[PDB]
Short mmCIF file of C-alpha atoms and ligand atoms in Angstrom, two decimals:
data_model
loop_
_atom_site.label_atom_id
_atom_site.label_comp_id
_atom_site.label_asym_id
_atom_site.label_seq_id
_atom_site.Cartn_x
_atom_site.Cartn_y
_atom_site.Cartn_z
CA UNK W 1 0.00 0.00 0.00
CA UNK W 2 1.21 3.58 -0.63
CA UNK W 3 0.91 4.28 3.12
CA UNK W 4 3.63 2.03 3.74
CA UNK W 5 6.03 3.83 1.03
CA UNK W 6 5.40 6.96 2.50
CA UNK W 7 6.64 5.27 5.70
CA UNK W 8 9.66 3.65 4.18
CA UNK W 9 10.75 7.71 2.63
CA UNK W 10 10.22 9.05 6.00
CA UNK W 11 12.48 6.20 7.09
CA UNK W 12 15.20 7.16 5.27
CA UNK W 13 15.38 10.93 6.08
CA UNK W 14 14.74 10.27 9.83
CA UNK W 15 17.80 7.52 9.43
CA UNK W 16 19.67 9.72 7.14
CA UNK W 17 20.07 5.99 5.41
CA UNK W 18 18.69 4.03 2.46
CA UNK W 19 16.29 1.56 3.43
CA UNK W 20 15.61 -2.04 1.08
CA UNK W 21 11.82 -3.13 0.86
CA UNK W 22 10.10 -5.61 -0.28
CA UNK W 23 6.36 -7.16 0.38
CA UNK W 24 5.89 -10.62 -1.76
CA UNK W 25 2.67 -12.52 -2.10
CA UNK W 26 3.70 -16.03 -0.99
CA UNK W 27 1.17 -17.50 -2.72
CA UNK W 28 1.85 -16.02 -6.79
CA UNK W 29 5.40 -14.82 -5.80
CA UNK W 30 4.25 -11.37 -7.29
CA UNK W 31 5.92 -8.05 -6.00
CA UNK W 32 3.39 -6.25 -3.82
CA UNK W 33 4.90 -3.10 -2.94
CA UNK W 34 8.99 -2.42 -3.50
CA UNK W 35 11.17 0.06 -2.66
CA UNK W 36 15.04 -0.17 -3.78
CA UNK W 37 14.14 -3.53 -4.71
CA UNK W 38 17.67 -3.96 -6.67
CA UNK W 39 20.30 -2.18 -4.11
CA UNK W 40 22.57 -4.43 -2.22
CA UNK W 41 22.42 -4.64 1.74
CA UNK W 42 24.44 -6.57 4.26
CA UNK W 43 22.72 -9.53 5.71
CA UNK W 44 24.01 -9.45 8.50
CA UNK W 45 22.05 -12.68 10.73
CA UNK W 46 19.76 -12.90 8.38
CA UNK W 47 21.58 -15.13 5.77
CA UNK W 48 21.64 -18.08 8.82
CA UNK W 49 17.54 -18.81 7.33
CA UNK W 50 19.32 -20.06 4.40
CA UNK W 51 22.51 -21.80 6.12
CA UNK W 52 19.64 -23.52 7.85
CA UNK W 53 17.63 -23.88 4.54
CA UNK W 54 21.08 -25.15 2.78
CA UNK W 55 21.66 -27.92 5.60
CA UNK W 56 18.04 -28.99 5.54
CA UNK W 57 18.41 -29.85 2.02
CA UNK W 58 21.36 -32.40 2.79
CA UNK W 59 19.60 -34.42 5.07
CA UNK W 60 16.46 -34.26 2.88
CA UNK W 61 19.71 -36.27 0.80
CA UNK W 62 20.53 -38.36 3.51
CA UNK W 63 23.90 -37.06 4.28
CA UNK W 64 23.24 -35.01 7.21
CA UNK W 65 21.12 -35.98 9.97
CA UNK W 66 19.49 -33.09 12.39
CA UNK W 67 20.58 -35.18 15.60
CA UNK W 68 24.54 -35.84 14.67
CA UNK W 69 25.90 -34.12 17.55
CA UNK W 70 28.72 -31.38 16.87
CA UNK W 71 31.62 -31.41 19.40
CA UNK W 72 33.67 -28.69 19.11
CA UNK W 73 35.81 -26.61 21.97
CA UNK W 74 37.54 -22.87 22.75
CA UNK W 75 38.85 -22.44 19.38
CA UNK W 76 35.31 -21.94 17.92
CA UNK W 77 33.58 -19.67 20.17
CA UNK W 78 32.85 -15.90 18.78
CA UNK W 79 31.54 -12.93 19.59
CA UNK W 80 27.41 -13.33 20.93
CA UNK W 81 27.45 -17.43 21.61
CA UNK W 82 25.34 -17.57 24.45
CA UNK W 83 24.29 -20.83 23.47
CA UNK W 84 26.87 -22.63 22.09
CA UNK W 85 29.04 -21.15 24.78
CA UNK W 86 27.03 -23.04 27.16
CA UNK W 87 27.15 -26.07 25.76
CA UNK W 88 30.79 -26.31 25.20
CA UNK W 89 31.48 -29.37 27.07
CA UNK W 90 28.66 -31.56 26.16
CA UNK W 91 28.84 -30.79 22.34
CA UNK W 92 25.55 -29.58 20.14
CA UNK W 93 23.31 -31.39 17.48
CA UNK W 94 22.80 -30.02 13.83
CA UNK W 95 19.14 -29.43 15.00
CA UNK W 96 20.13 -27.49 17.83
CA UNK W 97 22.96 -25.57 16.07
CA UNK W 98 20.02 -24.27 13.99
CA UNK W 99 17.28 -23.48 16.54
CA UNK W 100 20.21 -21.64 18.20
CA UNK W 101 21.34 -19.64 15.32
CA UNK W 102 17.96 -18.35 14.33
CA UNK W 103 16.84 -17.99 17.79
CA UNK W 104 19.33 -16.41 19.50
CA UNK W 105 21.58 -15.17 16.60
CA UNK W 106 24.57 -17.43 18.10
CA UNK W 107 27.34 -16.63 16.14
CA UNK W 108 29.66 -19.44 16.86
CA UNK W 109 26.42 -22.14 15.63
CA UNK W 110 26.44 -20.07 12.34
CA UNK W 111 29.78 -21.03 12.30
CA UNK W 112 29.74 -24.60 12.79
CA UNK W 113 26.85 -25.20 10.79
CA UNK W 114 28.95 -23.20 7.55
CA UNK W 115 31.37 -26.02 8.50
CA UNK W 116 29.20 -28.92 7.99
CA UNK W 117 28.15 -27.39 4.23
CA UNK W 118 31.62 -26.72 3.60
CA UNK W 119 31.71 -22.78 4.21
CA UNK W 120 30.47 -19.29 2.43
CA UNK W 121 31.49 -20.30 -0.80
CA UNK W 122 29.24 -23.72 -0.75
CA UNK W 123 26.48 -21.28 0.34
CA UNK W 124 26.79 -19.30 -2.21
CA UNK W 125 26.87 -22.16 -4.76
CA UNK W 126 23.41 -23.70 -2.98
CA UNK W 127 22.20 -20.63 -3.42
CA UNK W 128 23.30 -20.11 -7.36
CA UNK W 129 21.99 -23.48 -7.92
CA UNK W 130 18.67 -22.68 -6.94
CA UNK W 131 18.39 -19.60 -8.94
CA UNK W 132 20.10 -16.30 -6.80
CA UNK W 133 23.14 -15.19 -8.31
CA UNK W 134 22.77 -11.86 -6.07
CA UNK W 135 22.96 -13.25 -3.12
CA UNK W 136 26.20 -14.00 -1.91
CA UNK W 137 28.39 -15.23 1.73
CA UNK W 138 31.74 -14.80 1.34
CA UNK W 139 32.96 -14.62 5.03
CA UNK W 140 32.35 -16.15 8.46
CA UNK W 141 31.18 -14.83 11.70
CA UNK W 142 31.69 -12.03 12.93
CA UNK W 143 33.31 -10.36 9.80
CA UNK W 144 30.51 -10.58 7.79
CA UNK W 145 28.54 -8.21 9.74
CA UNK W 146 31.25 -5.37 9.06
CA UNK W 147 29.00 -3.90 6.16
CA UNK W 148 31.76 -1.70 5.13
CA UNK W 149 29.87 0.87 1.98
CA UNK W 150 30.17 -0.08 -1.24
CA UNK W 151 31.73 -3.78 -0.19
CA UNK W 152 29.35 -6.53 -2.23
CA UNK W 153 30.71 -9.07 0.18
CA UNK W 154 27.89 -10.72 2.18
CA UNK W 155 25.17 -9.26 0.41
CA UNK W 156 21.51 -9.61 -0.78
CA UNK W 157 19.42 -7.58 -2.93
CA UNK W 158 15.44 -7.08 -1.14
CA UNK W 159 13.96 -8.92 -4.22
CA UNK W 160 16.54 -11.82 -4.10
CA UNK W 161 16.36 -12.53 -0.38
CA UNK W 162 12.30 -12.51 -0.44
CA UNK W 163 12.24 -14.49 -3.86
CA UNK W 164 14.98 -16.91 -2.46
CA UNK W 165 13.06 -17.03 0.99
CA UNK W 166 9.49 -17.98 -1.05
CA UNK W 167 11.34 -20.60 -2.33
CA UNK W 168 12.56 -22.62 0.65
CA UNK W 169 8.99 -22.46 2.24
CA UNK W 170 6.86 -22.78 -1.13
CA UNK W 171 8.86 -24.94 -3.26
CA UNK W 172 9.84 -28.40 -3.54
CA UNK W 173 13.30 -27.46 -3.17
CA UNK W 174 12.85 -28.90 0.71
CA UNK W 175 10.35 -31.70 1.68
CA UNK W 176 7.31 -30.66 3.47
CA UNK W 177 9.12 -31.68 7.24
CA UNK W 178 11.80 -29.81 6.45
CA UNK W 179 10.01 -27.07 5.41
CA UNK W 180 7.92 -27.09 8.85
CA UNK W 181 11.02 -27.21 10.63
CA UNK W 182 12.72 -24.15 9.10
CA UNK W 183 9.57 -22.39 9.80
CA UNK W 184 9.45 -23.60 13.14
CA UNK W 185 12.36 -22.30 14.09
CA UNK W 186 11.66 -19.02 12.75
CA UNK W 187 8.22 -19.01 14.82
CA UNK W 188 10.07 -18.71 17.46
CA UNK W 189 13.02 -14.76 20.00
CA UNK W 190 15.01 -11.08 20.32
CA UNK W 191 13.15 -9.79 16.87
CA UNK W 192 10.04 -8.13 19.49
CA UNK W 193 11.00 -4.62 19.07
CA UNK W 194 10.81 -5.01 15.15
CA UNK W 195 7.92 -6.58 13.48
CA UNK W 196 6.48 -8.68 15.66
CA UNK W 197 5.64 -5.42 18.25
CA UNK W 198 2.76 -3.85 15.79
CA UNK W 199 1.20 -7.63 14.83
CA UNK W 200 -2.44 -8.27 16.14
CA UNK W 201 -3.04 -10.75 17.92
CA UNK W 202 -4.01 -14.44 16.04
CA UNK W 203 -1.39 -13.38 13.37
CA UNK W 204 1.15 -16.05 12.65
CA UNK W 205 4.88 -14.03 11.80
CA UNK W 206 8.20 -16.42 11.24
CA UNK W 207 10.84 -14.15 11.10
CA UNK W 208 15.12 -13.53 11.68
CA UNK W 209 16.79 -10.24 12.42
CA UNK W 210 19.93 -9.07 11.94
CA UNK W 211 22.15 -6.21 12.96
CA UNK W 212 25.79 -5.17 11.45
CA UNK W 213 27.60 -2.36 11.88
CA UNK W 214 27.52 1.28 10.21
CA UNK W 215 23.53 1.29 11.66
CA UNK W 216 23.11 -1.70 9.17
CA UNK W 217 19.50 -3.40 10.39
CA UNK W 218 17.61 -5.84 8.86
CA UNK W 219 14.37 -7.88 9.16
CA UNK W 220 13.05 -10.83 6.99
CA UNK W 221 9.82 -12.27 7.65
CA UNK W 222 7.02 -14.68 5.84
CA UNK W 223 2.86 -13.52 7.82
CA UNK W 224 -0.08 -13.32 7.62
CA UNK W 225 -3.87 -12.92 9.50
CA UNK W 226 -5.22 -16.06 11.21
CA UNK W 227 -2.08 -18.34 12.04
CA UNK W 228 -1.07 -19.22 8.50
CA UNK W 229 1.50 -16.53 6.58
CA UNK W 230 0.60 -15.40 3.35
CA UNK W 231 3.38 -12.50 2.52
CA UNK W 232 6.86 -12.09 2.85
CA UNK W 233 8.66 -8.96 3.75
CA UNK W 234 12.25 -8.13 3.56
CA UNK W 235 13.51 -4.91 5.27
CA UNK W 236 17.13 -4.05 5.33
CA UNK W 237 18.75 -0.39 5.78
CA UNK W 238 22.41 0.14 6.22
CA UNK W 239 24.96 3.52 6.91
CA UNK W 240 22.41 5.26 9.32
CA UNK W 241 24.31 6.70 12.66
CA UNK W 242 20.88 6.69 14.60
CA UNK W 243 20.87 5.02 17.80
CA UNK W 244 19.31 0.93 17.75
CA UNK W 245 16.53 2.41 19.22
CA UNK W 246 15.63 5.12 16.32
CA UNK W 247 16.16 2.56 13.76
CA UNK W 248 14.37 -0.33 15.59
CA UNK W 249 11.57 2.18 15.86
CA UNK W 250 11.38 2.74 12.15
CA UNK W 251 11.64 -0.83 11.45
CA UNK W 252 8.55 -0.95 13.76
CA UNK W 253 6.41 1.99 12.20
CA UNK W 254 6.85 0.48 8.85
CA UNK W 255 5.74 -2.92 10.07
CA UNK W 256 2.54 -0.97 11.84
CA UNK W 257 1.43 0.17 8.06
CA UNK W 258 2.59 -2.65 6.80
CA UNK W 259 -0.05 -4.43 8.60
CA UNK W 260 -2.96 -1.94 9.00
CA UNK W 261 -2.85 -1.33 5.34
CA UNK W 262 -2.79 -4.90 4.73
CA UNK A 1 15.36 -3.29 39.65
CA UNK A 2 17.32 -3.15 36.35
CA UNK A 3 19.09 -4.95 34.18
CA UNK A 4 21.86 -7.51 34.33
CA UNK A 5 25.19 -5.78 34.71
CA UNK A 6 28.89 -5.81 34.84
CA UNK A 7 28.44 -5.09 39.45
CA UNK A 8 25.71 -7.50 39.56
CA UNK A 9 28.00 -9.92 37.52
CA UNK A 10 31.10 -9.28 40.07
CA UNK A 11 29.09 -9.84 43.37
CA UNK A 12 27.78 -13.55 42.46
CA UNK A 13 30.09 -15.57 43.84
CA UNK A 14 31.39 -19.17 43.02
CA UNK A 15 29.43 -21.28 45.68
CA UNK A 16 26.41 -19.04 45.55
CA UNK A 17 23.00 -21.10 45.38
CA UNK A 18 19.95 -20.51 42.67
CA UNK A 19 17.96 -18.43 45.11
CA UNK A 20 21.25 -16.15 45.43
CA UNK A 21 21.89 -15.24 41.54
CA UNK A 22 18.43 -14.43 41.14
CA UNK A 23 18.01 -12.15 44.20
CA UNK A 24 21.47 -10.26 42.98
CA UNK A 25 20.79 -10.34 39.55
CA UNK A 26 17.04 -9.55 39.14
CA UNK A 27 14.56 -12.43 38.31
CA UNK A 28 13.07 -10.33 35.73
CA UNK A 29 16.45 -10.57 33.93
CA UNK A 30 16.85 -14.11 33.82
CA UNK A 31 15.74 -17.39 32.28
CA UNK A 32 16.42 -21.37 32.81
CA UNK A 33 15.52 -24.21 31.35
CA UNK A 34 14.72 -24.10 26.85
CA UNK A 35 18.60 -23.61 25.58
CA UNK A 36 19.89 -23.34 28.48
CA UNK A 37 19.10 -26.39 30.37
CA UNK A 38 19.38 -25.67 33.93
CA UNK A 39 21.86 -23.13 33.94
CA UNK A 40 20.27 -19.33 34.51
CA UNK A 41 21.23 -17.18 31.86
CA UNK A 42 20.67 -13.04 32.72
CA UNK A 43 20.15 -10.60 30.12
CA UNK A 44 21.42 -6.72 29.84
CA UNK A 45 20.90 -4.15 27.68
CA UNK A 46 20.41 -5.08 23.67
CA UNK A 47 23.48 -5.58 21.94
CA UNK A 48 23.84 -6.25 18.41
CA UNK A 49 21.14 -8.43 17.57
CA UNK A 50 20.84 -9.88 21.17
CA UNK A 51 22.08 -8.48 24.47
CA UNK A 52 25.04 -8.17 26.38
CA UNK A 53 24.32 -11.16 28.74
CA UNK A 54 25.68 -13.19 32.33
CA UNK A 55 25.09 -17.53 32.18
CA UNK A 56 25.63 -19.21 35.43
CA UNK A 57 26.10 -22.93 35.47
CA UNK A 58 25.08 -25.12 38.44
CA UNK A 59 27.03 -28.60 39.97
CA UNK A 60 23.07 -29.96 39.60
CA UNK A 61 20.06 -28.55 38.35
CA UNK A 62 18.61 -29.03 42.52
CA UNK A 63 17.34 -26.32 44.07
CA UNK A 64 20.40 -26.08 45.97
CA UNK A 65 23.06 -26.57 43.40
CA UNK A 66 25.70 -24.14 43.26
CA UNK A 67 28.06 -21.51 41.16
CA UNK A 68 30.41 -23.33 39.87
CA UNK A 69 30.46 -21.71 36.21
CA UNK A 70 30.32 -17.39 35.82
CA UNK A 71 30.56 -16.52 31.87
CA UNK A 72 29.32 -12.73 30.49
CA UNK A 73 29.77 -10.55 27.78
CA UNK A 74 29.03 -7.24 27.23
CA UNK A 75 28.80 -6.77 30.83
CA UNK A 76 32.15 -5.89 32.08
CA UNK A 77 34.84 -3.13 29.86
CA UNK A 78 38.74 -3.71 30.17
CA UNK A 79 40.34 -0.48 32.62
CA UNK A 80 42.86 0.44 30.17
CA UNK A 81 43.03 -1.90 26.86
CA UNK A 82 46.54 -1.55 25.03
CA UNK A 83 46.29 -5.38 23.44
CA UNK A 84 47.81 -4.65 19.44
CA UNK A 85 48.37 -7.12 16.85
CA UNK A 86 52.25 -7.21 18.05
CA UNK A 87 51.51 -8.12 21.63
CA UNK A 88 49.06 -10.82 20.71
CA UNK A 89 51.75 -12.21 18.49
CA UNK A 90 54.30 -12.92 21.28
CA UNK A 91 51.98 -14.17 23.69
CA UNK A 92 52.58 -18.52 23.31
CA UNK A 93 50.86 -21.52 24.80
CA UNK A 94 52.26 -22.46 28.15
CA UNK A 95 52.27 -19.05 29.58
CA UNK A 96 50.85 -18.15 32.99
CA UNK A 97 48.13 -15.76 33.78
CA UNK A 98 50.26 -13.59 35.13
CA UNK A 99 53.29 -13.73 31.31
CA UNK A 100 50.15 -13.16 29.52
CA UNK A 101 48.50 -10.14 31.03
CA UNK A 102 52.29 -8.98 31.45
CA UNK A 103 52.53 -9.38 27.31
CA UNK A 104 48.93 -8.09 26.38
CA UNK A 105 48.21 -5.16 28.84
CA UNK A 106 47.34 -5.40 32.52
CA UNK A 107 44.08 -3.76 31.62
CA UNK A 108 43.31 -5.58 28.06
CA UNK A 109 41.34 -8.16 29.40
CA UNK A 110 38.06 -8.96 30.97
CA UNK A 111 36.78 -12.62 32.25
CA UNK A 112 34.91 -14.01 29.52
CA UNK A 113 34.42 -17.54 30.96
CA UNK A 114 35.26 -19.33 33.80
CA UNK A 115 34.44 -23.09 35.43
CA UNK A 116 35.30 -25.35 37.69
CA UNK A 117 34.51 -29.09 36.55
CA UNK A 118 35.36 -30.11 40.06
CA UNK A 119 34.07 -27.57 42.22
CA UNK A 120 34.61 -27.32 45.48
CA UNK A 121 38.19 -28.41 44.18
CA UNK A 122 39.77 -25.64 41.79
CA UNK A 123 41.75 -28.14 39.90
CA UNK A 124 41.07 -28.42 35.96
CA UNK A 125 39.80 -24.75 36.45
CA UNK A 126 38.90 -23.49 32.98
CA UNK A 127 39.77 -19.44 31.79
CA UNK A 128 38.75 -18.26 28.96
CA UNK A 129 39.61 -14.09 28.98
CA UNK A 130 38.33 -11.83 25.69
CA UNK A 131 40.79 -9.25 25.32
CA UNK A 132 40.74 -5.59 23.62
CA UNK A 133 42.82 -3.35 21.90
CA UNK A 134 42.22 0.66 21.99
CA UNK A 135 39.14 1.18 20.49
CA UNK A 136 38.13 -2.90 20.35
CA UNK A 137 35.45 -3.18 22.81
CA UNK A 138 31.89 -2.26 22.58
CA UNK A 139 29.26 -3.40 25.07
CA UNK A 140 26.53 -2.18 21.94
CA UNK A 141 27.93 -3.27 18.83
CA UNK A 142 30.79 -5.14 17.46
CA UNK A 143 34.01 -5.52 18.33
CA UNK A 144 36.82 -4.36 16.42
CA UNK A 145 39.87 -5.46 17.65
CA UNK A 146 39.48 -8.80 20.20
CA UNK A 147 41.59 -11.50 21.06
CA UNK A 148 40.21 -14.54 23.46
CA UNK A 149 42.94 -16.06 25.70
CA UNK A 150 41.57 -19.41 27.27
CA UNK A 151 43.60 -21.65 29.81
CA UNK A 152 43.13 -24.55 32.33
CA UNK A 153 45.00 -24.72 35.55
CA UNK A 154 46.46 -21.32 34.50
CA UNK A 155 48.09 -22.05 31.98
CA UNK A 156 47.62 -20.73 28.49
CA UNK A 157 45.52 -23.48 26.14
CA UNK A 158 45.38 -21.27 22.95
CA UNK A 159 44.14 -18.31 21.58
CA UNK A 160 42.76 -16.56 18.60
CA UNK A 161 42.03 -13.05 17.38
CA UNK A 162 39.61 -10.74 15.37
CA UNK A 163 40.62 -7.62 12.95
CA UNK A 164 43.89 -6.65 15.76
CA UNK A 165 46.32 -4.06 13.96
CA1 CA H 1 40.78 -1.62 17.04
#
């Protein structure tokens, strides 16, 4: 809805920043509203969806399986693990690697999931194979969050993210279990202050946040009325030197039309 | 009554019980159980695209257990960081505590983790320390310029670094 652009322009003055948006029908796949649909953004935590999506596939294969436990030790750990960091001495499965990297953001179970698909550049090949040649991981926690302007490394463009996205919960490129599973674990925790703060209540939302640095801030999302999702949104801004709060609240206001122009 | 932070961190003590973090850190702050199994992990102020955060780690998941694990970040800055690329270089496995901070700054470093697999008895005690250079730390954001040192017994294990000049 024009409401919503008008939001996403005052966005960018208040931020001083260029601001990425996208709203997708899930159903068609057709571009509802756009705005800088074709400018690169950092990421930032928002690429571990499709780590998650990429490892899914393998044991849809048969050569992964979501309760292989991971042991791994000191040499690992990153900047913000509070899982992984916790569960240093008893090790972590593949399935909890993921619930704790979409979760929580845990940097060090980005990590060791990359590991187990063989790294950014095997990401980026999953992804090329299944049709995004934008989108692209070329380093690992917590580099890739340095969203230095002008640097194409560990970038997405809004329409490949939310094309990409409609994909790995619409198509057949997953089974239907895995499918449920990737959107369970985006059903469920430190996104409240973006989207999920202006949605009324019965909605379903399944979404993953990510911050960088240079006031990069992101938010992808598949929702809709009555529990079952029925749009995607991608929202990504980047070189803004407003405080988290002023851009979380823009983030926010632009969800709030988002929704009561729906 | 708050949130978590760096003073609250420092007063819970090894030994403490359940009842005791809570009461010092703020209930309101904290969570168990989910993730975290039956440790009680305490959040701060948003960081990044979490918080900056405290986990304590109990000998049982009783009522009664105690401290025997402390691990934080974002709660607690270094006094006077002066880690560099150089110092972190010369700084080998083997070293003491006390060769290391001498090597990377008396002031670089802040307790990231640390645990005592046989508590009451500190032997096999595990250190890990995250360590800053000038303008490296940032309870908000990211880091740019960190090194974590991590030893048992104290003695130096290993360590790595991030973006150090
Ligand atoms: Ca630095």
């Amino acid at each position: 809805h024009p409401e919503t652009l008008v939001k996403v322009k005052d966005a960018e003055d208040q931020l001083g920043a260029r601001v990425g948006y996208i709203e997708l029908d899930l159903n068609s796949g057709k571009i509802l509203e756009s705005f800088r649909p074709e400018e690169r953004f950092p990421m930032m935590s928002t690429f571990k969806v499709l780590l998650c999506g990429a490892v899914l596939s393998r044991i849809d294969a048969g050569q992964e399986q979501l309760g292989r436990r991971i042991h791994y030790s000191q040499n690992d750990l990153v900047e913000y693990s509070p899982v992984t960091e916790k569960h240093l001495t008893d090790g972590m499965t593949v399935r909890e690697l993921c619930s704790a990297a979409i979760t929580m953001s845990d940097n060090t179970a980005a990590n060791l999931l990359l590991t187990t698909i063989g790294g950014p550049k095997e990401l980026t090949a999953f992804l090329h194979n299944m049709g995004d040649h934008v989108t692209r991981l070329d380093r690992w926690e917590p580099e890739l969050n340095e969203a230095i302007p002008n640097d194409e490394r560990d970038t997405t463009m809004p329409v490949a993210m939310a094309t990409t996205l409609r994909k790995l919960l619409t198509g057949e490129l997953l089974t239907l279990a895995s499918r449920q599973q990737l959107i369970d674990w985006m059903e469920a925790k430190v996104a409240g202050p973006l989207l999920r703060s202006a949605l009324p209540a019965g909605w379903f939302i399944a979404d993953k946040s990510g911050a960088g640095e240079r006031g990069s801030r992101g938010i992808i999302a598949a929702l809709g009325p009555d529990g079952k999702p029925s749009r995607i949104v991608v929202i990504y801004t980047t070189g803004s030197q407003a405080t988290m709060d002023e851009r979380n609240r823009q983030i926010a206001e632009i969800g709030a039309s988002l929704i009561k122009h729906w | 009554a708050g949130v978590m932070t760096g003073a609250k961190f420092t007063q819970i003590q090894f030994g403490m019980t359940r009842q005791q973090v809570l009461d010092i850190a703020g209930a309101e702050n904290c969570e168990t159980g989910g993730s975290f199994g039956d440790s009680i992990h305490c959040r701060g102020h948003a960081a990044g695209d979490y918080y900056a955060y405290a986990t304590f780690g109990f000998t049982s998941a009783a009522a009664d257990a105690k401290v025997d694990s402390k691990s934080q970040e974002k709660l607690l800055a270094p006094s006077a960081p002066t880690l560099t690329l150089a110092k972190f270089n010369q700084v080998t496995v083997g070293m003491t505590r006390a060769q290391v901070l001498a090597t990377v700054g008396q002031g670089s470093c802040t307790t990231w983790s640390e645990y005592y697999p046989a508590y009451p008895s500190t032997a096999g005690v595990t250190l890990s320390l995250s360590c800053f250079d000038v303008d490296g730390y940032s309870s908000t954001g990211f880091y740019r310029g960190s090194a974590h040192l991590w030893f048992t017994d104290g003695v130096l294990q290993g360590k790595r670094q991030w973006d150090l000049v």
